[PDB]
Amino acid sequence: SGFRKMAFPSGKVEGCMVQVTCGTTTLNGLWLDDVVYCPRHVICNPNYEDLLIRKSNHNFLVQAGNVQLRVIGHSMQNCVLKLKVDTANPKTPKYKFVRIQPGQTFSVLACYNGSPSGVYQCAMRPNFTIKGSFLNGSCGSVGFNIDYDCVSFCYMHHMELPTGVHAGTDLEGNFYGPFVDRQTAQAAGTDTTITVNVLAWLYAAVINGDRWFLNRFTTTLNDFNLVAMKYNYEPLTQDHVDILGPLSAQTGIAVLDMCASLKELLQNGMNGRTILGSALLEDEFTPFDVVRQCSGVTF
Amino acid sequence: SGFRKMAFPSGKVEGCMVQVTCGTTTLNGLWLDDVVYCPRHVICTSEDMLNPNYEDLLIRKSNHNFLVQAGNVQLRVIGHSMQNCVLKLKVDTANPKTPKYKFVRIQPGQTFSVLACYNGSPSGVYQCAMRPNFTIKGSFLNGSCGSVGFNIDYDCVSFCYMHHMELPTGVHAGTDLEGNFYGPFVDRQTAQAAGTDTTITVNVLAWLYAAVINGDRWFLNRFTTTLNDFNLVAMKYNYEPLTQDHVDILGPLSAQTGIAVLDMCASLKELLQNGMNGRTILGSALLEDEFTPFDVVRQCSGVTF
Numbered sequence: 001s002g003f004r005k006m007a008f009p010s011g012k013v014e015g016c017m018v019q020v021t022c023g024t025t026t027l028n029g030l031w032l033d034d035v036v037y038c039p040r041h042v043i044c045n046p047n048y049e050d051l052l053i054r055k056s057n058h059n060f061l062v063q064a065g066n067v068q069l070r071v072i073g074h075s076m077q078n079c080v081l082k083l084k085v086d087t088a089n090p091k092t093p094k095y096k097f098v099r100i101q102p103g104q105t106f107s108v109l110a111c112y113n114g115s116p117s118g119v120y121q122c123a124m125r126p127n128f129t130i131k132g133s134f135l136n137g138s139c140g141s142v143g144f145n146i147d148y149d150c151v152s153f154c155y156m157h158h159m160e161l162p163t164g165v166h167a168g169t170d171l172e173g174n175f176y177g178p179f180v181d182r183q184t185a186q187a188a189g190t191d192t193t194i195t196v197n198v199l200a201w202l203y204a205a206v207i208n209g210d211r212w213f214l215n216r217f218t219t220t221l222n223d224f225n226l227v228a229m230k231y232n233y234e235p236l237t238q239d240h241v242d243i244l245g246p247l248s249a250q251t252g253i254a255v256l257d258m259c260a261s262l263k264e265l266l267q268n269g270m271n272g273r274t275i276l277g278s279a280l281l282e283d284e285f286t287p288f289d290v291v292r293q294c295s296g297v298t299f
Numbered sequence: 300s301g302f303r304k305m306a307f308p309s310g311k312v313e314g315c316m317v318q319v320t321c322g323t324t325t326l327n328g329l330w331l332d333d334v335v336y337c338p339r340h341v342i343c344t345s346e347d348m349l350n351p352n353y354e355d356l357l358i359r360k361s362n363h364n365f366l367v368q369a370g371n372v373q374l375r376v377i378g379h380s381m382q383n384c385v386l387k388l389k390v391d392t393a394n395p396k397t398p399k400y401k402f403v404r405i406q407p408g409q410t411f412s413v414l415a416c417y418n419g420s421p422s423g424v425y426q427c428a429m430r431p432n433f434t435i436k437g438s439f440l441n442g443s444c445g446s447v448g449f450n451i452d453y454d455c456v457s458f459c460y461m462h463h464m465e466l467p468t469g470v471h472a473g474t475d476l477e478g479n480f481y482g483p484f485v486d487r488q489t490a491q492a493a494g495t496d497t498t499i500t501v502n503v504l505a506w507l508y509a510a511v512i513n514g515d516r517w518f519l520n521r522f523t524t525t526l527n528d529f530n531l532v533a534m535k536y537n538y539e540p541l542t543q544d545h546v547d548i549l550g551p552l553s554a555q556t557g558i559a560v561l562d563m564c565a566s567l568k569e570l571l572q573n574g575m576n577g578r579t580i581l582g583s584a585l586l587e588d589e590f591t592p593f594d595v596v597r598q599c600s601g602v603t604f
């Protein structure tokens with residue numbers, strides 16, 4: 001019993017965190033094999049190729065724990081700087097670079113000065129921002145998932161937006177969202193609720209004994225989406241329905257049966273009640289996170 | 300900016316997790332130097348749990364009865380002793396990944412990270428608090444026994460909890476790393492229930508100061524209160540009594556934001572009376588009590604918005 005916002009064990013990622021200093025800017029780097037990846041804004045109308053050509057290898061100071069790593073080359077890939085170092089990381093885990101879709105969740109190892117300070121779970125919002133917890137010096141912190149023994153790196157932190165939400169790139173330097181790495185007027189678009197994730201969390205509640213919101217009714221996918229669109233909920237697709245299949249079979253509650261429950265919660269609210277200790281409908285647990293937490297998958 | 304329930308990086312603890320098997324039972328152990336710590340109930344049958352005589356069950360065991368597995372390697376048990384509700388298995392190999400550590404007993408209201416494990420393998424990390432009724436609201440399945448709670452302030456791991464059992468309401472009970480249970484609980488399948496829980500008042504206040512730091516003051520009012528009048532109101536909402544110690548501990552947050560603890564106490568009184576009225580505080584529609592005054596100072600900025 002119990003349902004918590006749970007992160008992946010961070011140990012395989014902690015062994016990769018390094019400190020990168022270039023002039024007045026100090027941020028975090030990800031050391032994998034003989035390359036250190038970090039936001040290209042550590043070199044900082046920024047013509048990044050023109051600013052980079054001026055720099056030499058010895059301008060970039062890289063620190064791994066108490067040891068100074070020696071930079072032997074440098075190249076840029078989109079909004080990420082790849083610093084070739086003299087020493088390969090002995091703690092390099094089995095890894096992949098993956099780009100995630102909005103609604104997908106991941107673990108963030110927040111770092112300052114190359115030292116990990118905390119780990120938390122979060123989701124890529126439909127508006128491509130993340131609601132993280134970061135202070136100045138957190139740039140270069142990474143987001144990841146673990147599938148068996150392989151670490152899938154999916155996010156690298158770059159900046160904070162005026163509303164407090166965060167923006168960054170995949171590990172190939174491509175931003176999530178219509179954002180750019182510079183000091184300019186940019187804002188997060190209007191956000192929406194991740195519908196498939198709220199449904200998964202309603203199934204997690206049923207598994208833990210919270211059945212007060214169940215009703216005798218069902219709905220069509222079209223009628224559910226007509227209602228969902230009016231409450232700023234993401235459209236629910238046939239793919240989402242198929243993905244919720246296992247949870248539907250386990251609890252005995254059809255996805256459109258549970259959709260009628262969500263429809264009633266949207267028009268009437270909770271009425272003094274809570275679901276899994278929450279007075280709000282929670283959308284930062286995917287259908288897979290619910291299955292993994294209510295089965296005990298290890299790493 | 301931002302306010303998340305944040306756990307400590309679990310790596311220093313992951314390199315300590317081992318699998319302990321005794322007969323038909325299998326749970327987790329904490330391998331520190333040449334000793335593996337685990338719940339003593341690994342030696343029990345399901346039957347034994349009604350009235351187990353651990354001393355009598357332990358005398359019947361030898362070192363080779365306890366199978367210890369660290370990753371793909373079998374560790375050899377060379378001794379065993381019991382300390383309260385924890386079994387200490389002396390092993391032949393010292394853990395090379397042993398971090399700098401201390402065993403600390405925490406008080407209710409204190410927070411800590413839990414590395415949930417199954418079969419000696421870590422599966423997740425989460426943050427939680429020792430409730431006033433000495434239980435924890437964890438996320439644990441069968442096989443999670445022996446999972447540990449810790450804090451990593453600076454470079455030292457402070458082990459404060461080892462998981463032992465799930466109570467009938469879904470809440471969890473366990474011991475410090477010396478085998479002393481938190482609460483009036485026993486490692487016995489007896490009729491035992493968690494006492495009525497209360498809200499950790501000093502933690503809700505800390506979280507209200509964290510919201511002011513992040514630029515939110517909608518909940519404040521022009522009123523103040525005496526500590527006694529605040530507690531007369533707080534008790535009526537199942538809130539823990541706020542002591543002068545709690546007021547002293549909130550001092551730094553009070554000075555940083557410019558709001559007196561008893562004035563913050565007056566906003567809390569108003570929030571209990573009126574509810575939130577469609578509004579949220581740090582993304583929450585409930586008053587949050589699982590962030591201590593120390594966690595707020597750690598996560599939040601030193602500059603108020």
Ligand SMILES: CN(CCC#N)S(=O)(=O)N1Cc2ccc(Cl)cc2[C@H](C(=O)Nc2cncc3ccccc23)C1
Pocket residue numbers: 041134135136137138139158159160161162163180181182183300
């Ligand atoms: C105006 N600033 C951001 C504050 C806002 N709104 S800044 O400090 O001058 N900033 C400018 C800037 C411009 C482009 C890029 Cl790609 C990055 C950056 C930096 C940035 O965003 N850093 C941060 C990340 N994450 C969290 C933070 C929290 C606080 C303060 C900086 C945080 C610095």
Ligand SMILES: CN(CCC#N)S(=O)(=O)N1Cc2ccc(Cl)cc2[C@H](C(=O)Nc2cncc3ccccc23)C1
Pocket residue numbers: 001340348439440441442443444463464465466467469471485486487488
């Ligand atoms: C009646 N049981 C509790 C489950 C409930 N409600 S049990 O499964 O027979 N249980 C009895 C018992 C009695 C004393 C002690 Cl110290 C330990 C134990 C064990 C225990 O508590 N294990 C678990 C821990 N943590 C989480 C769990 C989740 C699910 C299932 C076992 C979980 C076994």
Ligand SMILES: [Cl-]
Pocket residue numbers: 404405406409
């Ligand atoms: Cl304490």
